[PDB]
Structure formats: structure tokens, C-alpha cells
Symmetry: none
Subunit: 166 residues, 2 copies
Amino acid sequence: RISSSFSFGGFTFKRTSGSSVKREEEVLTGNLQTLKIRVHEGYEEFTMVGRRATAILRKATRRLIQLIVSGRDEQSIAEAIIVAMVFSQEDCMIKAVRGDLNFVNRANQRLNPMHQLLRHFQKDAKVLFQNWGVEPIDNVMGMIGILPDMTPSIEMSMRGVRISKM
Amino acid sequence: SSSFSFGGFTFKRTSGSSVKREEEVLTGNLQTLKIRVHEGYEEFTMVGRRATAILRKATRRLIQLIVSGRDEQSIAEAIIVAMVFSQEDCMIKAVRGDLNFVRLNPMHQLLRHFQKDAKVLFQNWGVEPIMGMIGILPDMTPSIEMSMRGVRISKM
């Protein structure tokens, strides 16, 4: 009776659609180190369940398609966004790494590269958010946007991200 | 190369060495197979599409298997491949069907057979009493009391 659900960054991921296989891929991080990451290859939809936030993540191979997030407050919403961005395995997230030369490193064998990246961005997500990209939004279905400085917007949002009410 | 593919897993030998010997084994279906037995202590990583594992083994004897996967099927898949690769007598004696797969070599015959259903394989393997990693029972129930001999599940 093993559950198909798994945990990452304080969220339980429950797959609701799609499927993936894993491939090994080299990625050049923002601290100029090359990591060998286990890339999810495929389209997948997950429900992310956390203590203070819930998110729906739709993604393709190394590409976030859509993230619908609700939460107790702006801080809790931000926490979910960070986890989804890391889980997406997007190049812009990889390239947003700054410093942590002995932590975000293949020489660091105490943690797998995905968790190295997660812990790095949970410390400070400023560069991650600033480099992710912003897009215009349609103010429909009661969904709003969130900008890189974590301010809500009815005009724009970080790419793929929408905030819903709880 | 120190790497090869078996059962959909890339095996990479990280330590040890082995020589091959031809050995007859009587299977659970009462037929005799001539298998190329790996002789010596070896350590491997296993990398698959849905699971990874660390395997330590000796001549016809699995010593340790640590498996990482997201669901029951993917974890079971890795365990099956490792158990077949171990060349253990209890695996050989667990065969319950014809080995007429196409004609594949004896090791792949065994692999194909157990990939159909591993219930008898897991039940006959044996359990043992058991910090981070947890045990796995023959019916794929996680446990912190017992586990299939030498087998543990972890997050890798």
C-alpha cells in the first residue's frame, strides 16, 4: 500500500493527470557549476498541498505551464511559488543561483541537486523571481497576478502564475 | 565500459570486480538453465526511467538493495531486476512458468518471467528483522519492523 504521492519543499504532490519518465541532464547554474539533474520528461498535472497554501501545477519537460495558487497570506503563496519554480526545472531557475559554491555543487553528495536548488531558493528567492519573467493576465475566473516583488496585480503576473481565493 | 543495461536499468559498477562462469541451475518449473554466473563482490548503481537503486552483491547472493521510486510499480520493478540480477537460488526456484520468451538468453528469460508477476518471487525471497530508510514486505507493504532480506526503500 505505497502511496503515489510524494513530498517536496513542504508540499505533498498528488498527480492528477499526465505522466513522466526521468532522464539525466547536465545544467549550468548561475554559480557556473554544472549539475547532473534527474529531469522529469512529460506533461504532468499536480495538486500541491501545504499547511498554509494549495497549488495546482501544470508542467511540461523543464517548463512550467500554469500554477494556480491560493493561501492564507502573501508569504504562504510565495512559498508555494518557489517550490513549483524549482520543481519545474526551468533553465531560468537554474540560472538564478547565486553563490553557494560548495552547496549547489555535484561535489556536495549529502543532498541531491534538486534539494540543493530547493534549499538555495528557500533562503532567498529575489533573483529567482526577478529572472522568471512577467506576463499580462486576463482578470477572469476571479484570478489575479503576483509580481516579482510579491505585490498583487490585476494587470500582470509572474509567468504562468495566478492567485485564486481559498 | 563499466556500464551496461539490464531490465530497463543502466547498471554502473562503482566498486569490485567479477569473472563469468557457466553454471547449471534447476528452476522452479523443473527445467535446467545454463547461466553465466558473475563471480565476485560488486557494487552497482541502477538508474531507470522511474526508479534508482544502490546494489551490493556477491556470487549468487544479494547483500544490500536500496531503492528509490515514487510509486509501488516503479519500486517493485527495480526490486525484480535486482533480484534476478543477483542470480540467487531462491529466485531461480521461484519460477512458475515456461521460459520460452523470444529466443532470449537465460537471464532475460528469468527477467521476462518475473516481470509478469513477482508475487512468488517476493514471497520466497525471505524476510528479516530491521534511521531514515524503511523496509518493504513481500506484498509491498512498508514496514519498520521487517523487510524483504537485504532490501530497503529510501529517498534518493
